[PDB]
Amino acid sequence: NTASWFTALTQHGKEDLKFPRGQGVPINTNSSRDDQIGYYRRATRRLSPRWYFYYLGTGPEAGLPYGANKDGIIWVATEGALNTPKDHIGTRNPANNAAIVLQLPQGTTLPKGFYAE
Ligand SMILES: [Zn+2]
């Protein structure tokens, strides 16, 4: 029920989403180095699946610890991130804020059949 802060990654292909370690946390300048960790969750349909990012300890799978195994949940973190729930970041209120356009830093390797839109 809680909304992601970011727009989705579209799964235009076959394989499930996955990133190298250290990669895949959306850019968000209203979040600190401590805050750069969480999960993408594949959504159940409204066609190509969409994956949405949530900060660790927020959202549909807030109760999961990092790296926990669940179908349609994959984990990402940046070096420096604290392994704690991001209660102060939370999830987005669509009444107050539009989705942030999901952007990843230069070089980042999106898997085959994924694009930011
Ligand atoms: Zn913070």
Numbering used by the authors: 48 to 93, 104 to 174
Can you list sentences taken from the study reporting this PDB entry?
Compared to the WT, the nat_mutants D63G and P80R appeared to form more distinct complex bands with SL4ext in the EMSAs. Interestingly, in contrast to the other nat_mutants, NMR-derived CSD plots for both mutants revealed more significant changes in comparison to the WT, suggesting a more far-reaching modulation of their fold or plasticity toward complex formation with RNA. We further investigated the RNA-binding of D63G and P80R, located in the N-loop and counter finger, respectively, by NMR spectroscopy. We were able to solve the 1.7 Å and 1.9 Å crystal structures for D63G and P80R, respectively. Surprisingly, both mutant structures superimposed with WT similarly well as the other nat_mutants, with RMSD values of 0.668 Å (D63G) and 0.898 Å (P80R), respectively. From those, only P80R and D63G exhibit slightly increased affinity for RNA, which likely correlates with an increased positive surface charge that possibly supports RNA engagement. The effects are moderate and may be neglectable in the full-viral context, which is in line with earlier findings using P80R (and A119S) variants of N testing the infectiousness of virus-like SARS-CoV-2 particles, where no significant effect was observed. On the protein level, mutations D63G and P80R also impact the gene product of the overlapping shifted open reading frame ORF9b47,48, where they result in T60A and Q77E, respectively.
